[PDB]
A paper describes a structure:
Bromodomains (BRDs) are protein interaction modules that specifically recognize ε-N-lysine acetylation motifs, a key event in the reading process of epigenetic marks. Despite large sequence variations, all BRD modules share a conserved fold that comprises a left-handed bundle of four α helices (αZ, αA, αB, αC), linked by loop regions of variable length (ZA and BC loops), which line the Kac binding site and determine binding specificity.
The frequent combination of multiple interaction modules in the same protein suggests that the epigenetic reading process involves concomitant recognition of several PTMs.
Author numbering: 1398 to 1652
The structure:
């Protein structure tokens, strides 16, 4: 049953690296230029690339799609253009590798498009963006409007509260939550609420259960819950559409 789409994609990329390595005359691009032999090379080339580095990157799961892989590959040709010359023999050799890569990626175009959706199912998904937008409005319109909430709007300032980060191991604030929303970190309200509740847990632990600041944090948490309830039906639909889209993508990658 379930194979990880990033493993499947990386294996195709790795196979392409090996086909490029096999090509005649490509050896100077297999490994990084040796600084001790080409003494000025890294003064000219500031983003170096070679087949070994590319393969380590594939291994490290750095590429979620064709596009980021190809970009790095192309840097091998651009760097040769710059260093050896746009029309130099070595530059035509590097281009021979880019050309083989494109041919192999065209060959596997349908499987790759499916792996790529499975790896990043919610890129430009209107349901995720709509869901994020509603959460961001709960934060800015409701949670940040709680009287005296400002000290929870941004991370605690160490300058005025110097033991904070010694006491609190997992700090959280509304600005950090908004940054998470902006990056579409939350797919359902459960993970958003983990962060919102962490704000109150930190204040119960640092300021104490009866502190005025804990009472404020408690009101921020209450308004968050009340507004989510208000919007429950609309949010359930979005959550359903998001969780379903992820699953459908992972299955079409298998099938």
């Amino acid at each position: 049953r379930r194979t990880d789409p990033m493993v499947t994609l990386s294996s195709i990329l790795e196979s392409i690296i090996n086909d490029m390595r096999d090509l005649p005359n490509t050896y100077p691009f297999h490994t990084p230029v040796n600084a001790k032999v080409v003494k000025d090379y890294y003064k000219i080339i500031t983003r170096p690339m070679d087949l070994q580095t590319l393969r380590e990157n594939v291994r490290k799961r750095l590429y979620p799609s064709r596009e980021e892989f190809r970009e790095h590959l192309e840097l091998i040709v651009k760097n040769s253009a710059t260093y050896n010359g746009p029309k130099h023999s070595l530059t035509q050799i590097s281009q021979s590798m880019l050309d083989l890569c494109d041919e192999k990626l065209k060959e596997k175009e349908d499987k790759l498009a499916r792996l790529e959706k499975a790896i990043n199912p919610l890129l430009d998904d209107d349901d995720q963006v709509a869901f994020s937008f509603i959460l961001d409005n709960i934060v800015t319109q409701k949670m940040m409007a709680v009287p005296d909430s400002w000290p929870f709007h941004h991370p605690v300032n160490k300058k005025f509260v110097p033991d904070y980060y010694k006491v609190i191991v997992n700090p959280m604030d509304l600005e950090t939550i908004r940054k998470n929303i902006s990056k579409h970190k939350y797919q359902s309200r459960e993970s958003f609420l983990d962060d919102v509740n962490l704000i109150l847990a930190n204040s119960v632990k640092y300021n104490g259960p009866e502190s005025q600041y804990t009472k404020t944090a408690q009101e921020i948490v209450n308004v968050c819950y009340q507004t989510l309830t208000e919007y429950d039906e609309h949010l359930t639909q979005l959550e359903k559409d998001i969780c379903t889209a992820k699953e459908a993508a992972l299955e079409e990658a298998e099938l």
